[PDB]
Design a protein around this ligand. Structure first.
Ligand SMILES: CCCCCCCCCCCCCCCCCC(=O)OC[C@H](COP(=O)([O-])OCC(O)COP(=O)([O-])OC[C@@H](COC(=O)CCCCCCCCCCCCCCCCC)OC(=O)CCCCCCCCCCCCCCCCC)OC(=O)CCCCCCCCCCCCCCCCC
Ligand SMILES: CCCCCCCCCCCCCCCCCC(=O)OC[C@H](COP(=O)([O-])OCC[N+](C)(C)C)OC(=O)CCCCCCCCCCCCCCCCC
Ligand SMILES: CCCCCCCCCCCCCCCCCC(=O)OC[C@H](COP(=O)(O)OCCN)OC(=O)CCCCCCCCCCCCCCCCC
Ligand SMILES: CCCCCCCCCCCCCCCCCC(=O)OC[C@H](COP(=O)(O)OCCN)OC(=O)CCCCCCCCCCCCCCCCC
Ligand SMILES: CCCCCCCCCCCCCCCCCC(=O)OC[C@H](COP(=O)(O)OCCN)OC(=O)CCCCCCCCCCCCCCCCC
Ligand SMILES: *P(=O)(O)OCC(C)(C)[C@H](O)C(=O)NCCC(=O)NCCSC(=O)CCCCCCCCCCCCC
Ligand SMILES: CCCCCCCCCCCCO[C@@H]1O[C@H](CO)[C@@H](O[C@H]2O[C@H](CO)[C@@H](O)[C@H](O)[C@H]2O)[C@H](O)[C@H]1O
Ligand SMILES: CCCCCCCCCCCCO[C@@H]1O[C@H](CO)[C@@H](O[C@H]2O[C@H](CO)[C@@H](O)[C@H](O)[C@H]2O)[C@H](O)[C@H]1O
Ligand code: SF4
Ligand code: SF4
Ligand code: SF4
Lengths: 39, 66, 60, 378, 332, 122, 185, 49, 153
């Protein structure tokens, strides 16, 4: 599709059990949440 | 905030300090003391918060002002 | 130096319409679901009002 | 009876009105907090420790505000008008049952009572809009009245379909009849129409464009009248909460909790008189529940009049709150509909479907011998 | 007089000052350096995104959708941090000036715009989740405010008001300026000339402006960001404090100003609200003899009667928002 | 009056017979309208004071013998008439045409030499 | 409406499709009408936001980001010695876009060229920063201070006694912002 | 803004200036700050010129 | 004395907790007042709700350049605000005319038309700056003696 993977999107990521939960109950798993990265 | 975050910070700052923050800032927040102003204000930092929230101030006066 | 791009250039960003169809909102799975819910409910109602009518025979 | 009726009358009326009023105050705080999480911000979080005092300061501020509305040529109307709009808002709560028969008035015609108090709502939107002086805005109060009467037919005609299934207009009987099944399951499309009709009836967004356009044509000479009055705000929030409780009474369980005590009976088969309470299940073992300490105490508390009543009202409360969420979620999800388009929705889509279902439902109840008895059972 | 242009269309600041700089630069007969050309085309598209976030989301806030407005104003809140890093203003930068830009961009900004870039499409997609296929949204913009292609031209319509009726025309493609001839982008052109077409054309420009900003990041050349001539642009502070000629040129530029040769020019750019142009008469002196601003919204509001005729008032509020209208632009 | 209630398409007087016809029709409309101007703008003056003051504003240009000058003076009147008969002018603009509602009043130039000398040029 | 020369390849639209030529099954078409599926998707996107972190800042305890180039309230600075940097050139008075600066100078008792008046109308100023770009001695700057709402606008007529007091107050932060941005100036 | 008069125009009225405004501001003889200013008069209860 | 003071503190607590501003977004400063309603700075968290009507409002925020044509409608809207009334002047244009101070069409300060209680500087003030001005006004109300002034006379 037109999407690129979330892992290259420079936003805070969900981790672990919450990542699996997010990648299940969400329209587009590749969508970011717009929260920037502190470091 | 969210329960995981607010629970952990109670385990750090204690219930007397938890109520102090609810009266002023309105958030439960924990961080390292960075220094004190001449006016008595105290500054805290935490790289692990949401962006633009890594630095905050605990004012010395009750009728605080920026 | 100046503010310049990285040597190889920045990577491409996502800019086209993504908007991916999900099964949760397609009409066929929802039509089938709503139908099975109303059929299960209509079986449960047809059993209950029969029992209610029989409880009324005992009351009378 | 053990004590005097007037005392009993007073305690039940205070026990319904003071929780209902405190709840109507927290729906206003809740609608600003919920819309902020969906809009990635915060709701009120400063007036009070968690913003839990926001409703209080808003209400006391308005009470202390000057009111400059016309007192000329109409003194009673300016003052005694909106007061009974608030009475017509709270008068519907007197037929809500918080458990079997646990209502202020247990009324056999309870449904026709809440259809009467609802037709009085049209006066509190008609008359208030009569105060404002601006030609286009006055016609916007008539258009809001036209929306209410049209979406009242939606509600009354779809309440009719529940009465066919229950056989009664008593809210207690209507809930007790759902012990077999919640009416959302067999009357799915009737429930959706009722909820959509219930948003349009409350004048809530996305059906509020008629009353919305008043603020855009006010001009440079005149202004509104709902200004310092908390009445038409408590009348509004209390009608939303009341449309959520009635929606739960009719289609969700009402106060019916799906009881797990039935499930444990089916699964458990190794009853032991020694208090072991062994279970014939694959994750089961020999429990060490204390007969002297826990089982004797737990059994008594389950049958307490306070505990069982508590769960019946926590059930109705949890269900009303879920619907209060769906009203707030609806306002935050959609744009507004034009008045002609909402009118087309009611008159050329919804009502045709409802009158089609008015034919079909009693036809099926006759075909499966399922007409209920209309005598006092249940 | 350059700060006056920030305050014309106050949601699209660096493109207002771009058309004034391009007009003065044309009478100056100067060529501005490549780096400022790319800086200006990058911040002209950051500006176009900023304006469309105001215009599209305020339009839907009038129509009654209130949530996309708040989501994209965080996107607006992030993109004004880049204004305040190059200049020190969240709104009125005064950054674009005749001869290039006032100051070089700071040394970590092109990385921070790229980090914003990686996620901005997801913001358009979720804003698009709420409006594009929504039937209430569709039934409030279809057939509303319909202008024919012949009438849009005869009515002085530019931009998406011109482009939504099926006329393929963008000043960037037809009279290229700055680094626009160096970037690949597409032009959304509608069919039915209505508000729904103009909403769909504006959303497509979100994705096209993002596609330009990424290209500008990869072609950012090095060199002066300011025309290399101290009779026109101010010398560096370090030169003014060390070299005689530089302090003289510094002193005269801040008191008298530079002289512009005589003549007049009409210069237009593809502003976010339509075509924005300025007519500048020069008298060969250091002050403009006459400045006239052509504002796209002024011509759009003039055709409001011809377009809203026979419509409902709830229809007219939709027509007001589809015409990108900031009244400081209309009244100059 | 196609676009607005009192709009008149800009016309150029053909000759003095035409130009005087238009002036008289302009004056007639204004002094007709004076009761309507005095209620809307709540002018605390008699309709007679309004009409006599309308007359002064025509009496200023009674000696214009240029036809190109009359048309601009007629267009100015028509436009003033349109913005007054539509409630577009504020009471502040209208009752500021009367030059006695200044806190110095109508007497704002010095009367003669000596009184303006003792007051420093008024 | 199209450019001169040959019309664009397939500029003209295809002929419209009749209702029965459309490619959408009645089942899909009727289901999307009655179930309101596209509206359901949008309501689901708001649930996704509900469970995402908010953007909000608790002010005044947490502040938003400001660059070294920020343009706040004016200040008059000194040298390390303690002498005022200002020598009354009046360049900042000439370049003011809004004529907000009024300067009167003369010879000081010791013979030095120094201002006697230095007024800035904070209600005329547009905070452009031009005054500080034109300085040859870094004498006038704009501090990062944006929090100084006052009660009366007489408090917004800064005279030379207030602008020097501001520089004394804000000097560490002024020197720091100058240190960051000087290479670019 | 200039006083130029356009023969044939329907509804040639002012577009920018205030309602009783006298003068043409883009004329070069017109002064930058104009000839009049407004304020609120407490004694007259309105805005005066 | 305590009793009348308590009546003041409660009254001032509610004038502070519910802070509903009527607004005249004349120009750009209104954009910055819109960024006070967005997620980064939300007004709702402090109780601020902008109301359209003057009858429902507490404070007027003049944000933008006031022109001679706009001034009659400014005074009309302020004249319709029920008491108690506060006005905030936001930005250089409303405060003293600003960039357009030497023009024939601009009122040089909105306080030639209405009374003002706080002046917020900047063109435009940052959103924090307008927040700072609201806190100054909220502090002015906390120091408002209502029933303690009636007691001295
Ligand atoms: C379809 C429905 C969901 C659609 C929306 C998308 C959901 C989503 O993306 O979830 C992933 C998302 C991942 O987010 P994250 O940033 O990785 O959170 C990590 C934190 O450690 C999380 O910190 P935390 O403290 O929030 O998490 C622990 C715990 C803390 O909460 C509790 O233990 C109880 C809270 C509720 C009771 C008190 C009031 O929260 C939960 O486990 C969920 C409890 C609340 C569920 C119901 C909420 C109302 C509806 O998970 C959630 O935040 C919630 C999960 C989904 C809940 C659906 C209901
Ligand atoms: C039960 C749900 C409501 C609980 C309210 C408890 C009282 C409370 O909010 O405490 C904070 C309150 C004060 O809240 P506050 O409104 O002063 O909080 C101010 C916070 N800032 C500075 C950010 C604006 O404590 C009290 O003074 C107690 C008042 C009790 C009133 C009656 C209840
Ligand atoms: C809610 C969230 C949980 C459901 C979705 C979770 C999920 O990821 O399920 C998988 C799939 C999603 O869709 P799909 O495109 O197939 O995913 C491909 C993935 N590789 O899921 C599916 O394809 C099935 C999703 C469910 C479809 C049927 C739902 C029926 C619900 C009850 C009937 C409701 C109908 C009435 C609605 C009335 C509206 C007015
Ligand atoms: C259409 C809606 C159908 C609702 C379900 C009706 C049903 O299941 O009827 C079951 C009924 C037997 O009555 P019941 O109480 O379920 O069982 C008694 C003990 N065996 O037995 C019947 O009445 C038989 C039902 C046969 C027809 C089912 C529907 C056919 C048309 C579709
Ligand atoms: C939780 C989810 C629900 C939350 C609230 C949702 C409220 C939805 C309100 C939508 C109203 C839309 C409207 O005004 O009408 C749209 C339309 C009927 O109008 P029509 O002229 O046929 O338009 C055709 C193309 N839409 O189409 C319709 O709306 C008709 C759809 C049928 C409505 C439900 C009937 C039972 C199934
Ligand atoms: P008789 O034949 O003696 O005189 C007829 C005229 C006057 C036509 C002369 O014969 C004549 O030729 N004079 C020269 C032509 C002339 O009068 N030119 C000017 C005509 S237009 C004009 O005078 C407009 C005046 C102002 C219009 C507005 C007046 C009212 C405004 C304020 C009203 C009160 C506040 C709202
Ligand atoms: C306690 C009994 C009742 C007494 C009166 C209580 C106060 C009643 C009014 C407040 C209740 C909520 O009322 C609602 O508030 C929100 C702000 O949170 C307003 O919302 C407004 O600001 C938000 C801010 O993000 C915008 O998204 C929205 O577009 C705008 O309209 C609504 O316009 C108003 O209808
Ligand atoms: C079908 C069975 C129905 C059973 C339940 C019936 C409940 C009837 C309660 C009526 C109480 C008054 O009804 C309610 O009045 C208020 C005030 O006039 C209205 O509220 C009105 O004013 C408020 C502001 O104060 C606005 O935000 C709102 O948009 C407007 O419509 C509601 O639109 C109306 O729903
Ligand atoms: S502050 Fe600088 S520019 Fe202004 S008068 Fe002093 S030396 Fe000159
Ligand atoms: S920032 Fe203010 S004082 Fe300085 S030059 Fe600009 S307008 Fe004048
Ligand atoms: S003060 Fe500045 S930002 Fe505000 S309206 Fe005036 S010019 Fe615009």
């Amino acid at each position: 599709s037109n999407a690129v993977s979330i892992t290259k999107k420079y936003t805070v990521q969900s981790t672990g059990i919450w990542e699996r939960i997010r990648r299940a109950l969400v329209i587009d798993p590749n969508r970011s949440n717009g929260v920037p990265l502190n470091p | 905030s969210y329960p995981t975050r607010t629970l952990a910070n109670l385990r750090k700052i204690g219930l007397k300090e938890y109520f102090r923050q609810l009266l002023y800032i309105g958030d439960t927040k924990y961080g390292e003391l960075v220094g004190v102003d001449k006016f008595g204000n105290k500054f805290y930092e935490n790289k692990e918060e949401l962006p633009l929230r890594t630095r905050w101030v605990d004012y010395a006066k009750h009728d605080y002002d920026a | 130096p100046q503010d310049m791009p990285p040597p190889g250039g920045y990577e491409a960003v996502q800019y086209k319409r993504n908007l991916p169809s999900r099964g949760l909102f397609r009409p066929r799975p929802l039509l089938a679901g709503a139908a099975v819910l109303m059929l299960y409910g209509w079986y449960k109602l047809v059993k209950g009002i029969r029992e209610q009518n029989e409880l009324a025979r005992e009351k009378m | 009876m053990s004590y005097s009726q007037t005392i009993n009358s007073l305690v039940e009326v205070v026990l319904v009105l003071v929780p209902s009023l405190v709840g109507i105050a927290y729906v206003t705080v809740g609608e600003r907090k919920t819309m902020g999480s969906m809009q990635r911000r915060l709701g009120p979080n400063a007036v009070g420790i968690y913003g839990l005092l926001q409703a209080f300061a808003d209400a006391l501020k308005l009470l202390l505000k000057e009111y400059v509305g016309p007192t000329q040529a109409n003194l009673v109307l300016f003052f005694l008008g909106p007061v009974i709009t608030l009475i017509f808002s709270l008068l519907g709560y007197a037929v809500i049952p918080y458990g079997p028969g646990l209502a202020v008035n247990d009324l056999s015609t309870g449904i026709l009572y809440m259809l009467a108090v609802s037709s009085l709502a049209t006066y509190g939107i008609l008359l208030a809009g009569w105060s404002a002086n601006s030609k286009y805005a006055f016609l916007g109060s008539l258009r809001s009245t036209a929306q209410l009467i049209s979406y009242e037919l939606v509600l009354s005609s779809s309440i009719l379909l529940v009465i066919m299934l229950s056989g009664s207009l008593s809210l207690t009987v209507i809930v007790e009849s759902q012990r077999a099944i919640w009416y959302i399951l067999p009357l799915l499309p009737v429930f959706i129409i009722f909820f959509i009709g219930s948003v349009a009836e409350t004048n809530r967004a996305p059906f509020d464009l008629a009353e919305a356009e008043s603020e855009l044509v006010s001009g440079f000479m005149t202004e509104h009248a709902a200004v310092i009055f908390v009445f038409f705000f408590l009348a509004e929030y209390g009608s939303i909460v009341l449309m959520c409780i009635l929606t739960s009474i009719l289609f969700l369980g009402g106060y019916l909790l799906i009881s797990l005590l039935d499930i444990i009976y089916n699964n458990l088969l190794s009853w032991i008189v020694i208090g072991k309470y062994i279970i014939f299940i694959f994750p089961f073992w020999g429990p060490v529940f204390i007969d002297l300490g826990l089982y004797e105490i737990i059994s008594y508390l389950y049958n307490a009049p306070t505990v069982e009543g508590s769960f019946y009202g926590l059930s109705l409360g949890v269900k009303t709150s879920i619907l209060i969420f769906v009203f707030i979620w609806t306002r935050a999800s959609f744009p507004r509909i034009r008045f002609d388009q909402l009118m087309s929705f009611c008159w050329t889509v919804l009502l045709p479907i409802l009158f089609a279902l008015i034919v079909l439902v009693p036809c099926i109840l006759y075909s499966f011998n399922i007409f209920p008895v209309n005598i006092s059972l249940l | 007089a350059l700060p006056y242009f920030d305050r014309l269309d106050y949601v699209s600041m660096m493109t207002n000052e771009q058309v004034f700089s391009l007009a003065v630069e044309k009478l100056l007969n100067i060529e501005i350096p490549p780096r400022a050309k790319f800086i200006r085309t990058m911040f002209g598209e950051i500006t176009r995104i900023l304006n469309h976030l105001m215009s599209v989301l305020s339009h839907a806030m009038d129509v009654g959708a209130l949530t996309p407005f708040l989501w994209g104003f965080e996107e607006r809140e992030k993109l004004m941090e880049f204004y305040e890093r190059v200049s020190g203003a969240r709104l009125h930068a005064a950054y674009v000036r005749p001869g290039g830009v006032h100051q070089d961009i700071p040394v970590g900004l092109l990385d921070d715009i790229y980090q914003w870039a990686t996620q901005f499409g997801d913001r358009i997609d979720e804003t698009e989740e709420m409006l594009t296929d929504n039937r209430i949204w569709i039934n409030r913009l279809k057939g509303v405010g319909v202008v024919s292609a012949a009438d849009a031209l005869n009515l002085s319509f530019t931009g998406v008001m011109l482009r939504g009726s099926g006329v393929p025309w963008d000043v960037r493609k037809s009279s290229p300026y700055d680094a626009y001839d160096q970037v690949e982008f597409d032009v959304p052109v509608g069919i039915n000339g209505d508000c729904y077409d103009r909403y769909l054309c504006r959303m497509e420009e979100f994705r096209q402006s993002l596609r330009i900003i990424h290209q500008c990041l990869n072609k950012m050349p090095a060199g002066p960001v300011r025309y290399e001539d101290y009779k026109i642009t101010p010398p560096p502070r370090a030169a003014m404090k060390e070299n005689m000629e530089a302090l003289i040129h510094h002193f005269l530029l801040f008191t008298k100003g530079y002289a512009v040769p005589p003549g007049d020019t009409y210069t237009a750019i593809e502003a976010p609200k339509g075509e924005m142009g300025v007519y500048v008469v020069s008298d060969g002196s250091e002050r403009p003899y006459r400045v006239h601003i052509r504002a796209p919204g002024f011509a759009h509001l003039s055709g409001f009667d011809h377009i809203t005729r026979g419509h409902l008032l709830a229809d007219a509020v939709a027509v007001i928002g589809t015409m990108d209208l900031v009244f400081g632009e209309v009244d100059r | 009056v196609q676009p607005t209630k009192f709009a008149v398409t800009v016309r150029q007087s053909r000759n003095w017979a035409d130009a005087k016809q238009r002036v008289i029709a302009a004056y007639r409309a204004w002094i007709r309208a004076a009761p309507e101007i005095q209620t809307m703008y709540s002018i605390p003056f008699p309709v007679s004071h309004i009409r006599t003051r309308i007359r002064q504003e025509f009496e200023r240009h009674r000696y214009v013998n240029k036809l190109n000058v009359v048309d601009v003076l007629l267009q100015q009147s028509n436009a003033d008439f349109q913005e007054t008969m539509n409630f577009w002018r504020q009471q502040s603009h209208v009752m500021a045409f009367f030059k006695e509602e200044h806190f110095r009043g109508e007497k704002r130039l010095p009367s003669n030499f000596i009184t303006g000398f003792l007051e420093g040029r008024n | 409406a199209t450019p001169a020369g040959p019309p664009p390849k397939n500029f003209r639209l295809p002929p419209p499709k009749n209702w029965d030529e459309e490619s959408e099954s009645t089942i899909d078409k009727v289901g999307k009408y009655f179930l309101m599926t596209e509206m359901l998707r949008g309501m689901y996107v708001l649930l996704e936001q509900f469970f995402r972190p908010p953007y909000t800042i608790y002010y005044p305890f947490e502040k938003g980001p400001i660059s070294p180039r920020f343009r706040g309230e004016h200040a008059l600075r000194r040298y390390p010695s303690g002498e005022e940097r200002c020598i009354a050139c009046k360049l900042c008075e000439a370049v003011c876009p809004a004529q907000a600066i009024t300067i009167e100078a003369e010879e000081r008792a010791d013979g030095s060229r120094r201002t006697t008046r230095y007024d800035i109308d904070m209600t005329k100023c547009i905070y452009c920063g031009f005054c500080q770009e034109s300085c040859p001695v870094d004498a006038i700057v704009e501090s990062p201070n944006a929090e100084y709402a006052t009660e009366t606008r007489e408090e917004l007529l800064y005279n030379k006694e207030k602008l020097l007091a501001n520089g004394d107050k804000w000097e560490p932060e002024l020197a720091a912002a100058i240190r960051a941005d000087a290479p670019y100036r | 803004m200039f006083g130029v008069l356009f023969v044939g125009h329907p509804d040639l009225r002012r577009i920018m200036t205030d309602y009783g405004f006298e003068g043409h501001p883009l004329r070069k003889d017109f002064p930058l700050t104009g000839y009049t200013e407004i304020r609120y008069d407490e004694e007259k209860k309105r805005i005066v010129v | 004395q305590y009793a009348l003071t308590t009546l003041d503190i409660i009254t001032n607590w509610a004038r502070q907790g519910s802070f509903w501003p009527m607004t005249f977004g004349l120009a750009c400063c209104a954009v910055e007042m819109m960024h006070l309603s967005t997620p980064r700075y939300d007004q709702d968290r402090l109780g601020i709700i902008f109301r359209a009507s003057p009858r429902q409002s507490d404070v007027m925020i003049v944000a933008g350049t006031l022109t001679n044509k706009m001034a009659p409608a400014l005074r009309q809207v302020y004249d319709q605000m029920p008491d108690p009334r506060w006005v905030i002047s936001m930005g250089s244009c409303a405060n003293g005319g600003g960039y357009y101070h030497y023009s024939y069409s601009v009122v040089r300060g909105c306080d030639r038309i209405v009374p003002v209680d706080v002046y917020v500087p900047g063109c435009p003030p940052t959103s924090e700056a307008l927040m700072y001005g609201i806190f100054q006004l909220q502090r002015k109300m906390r120091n408002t003696k209502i029933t303690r002034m009636w007691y001295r006379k």
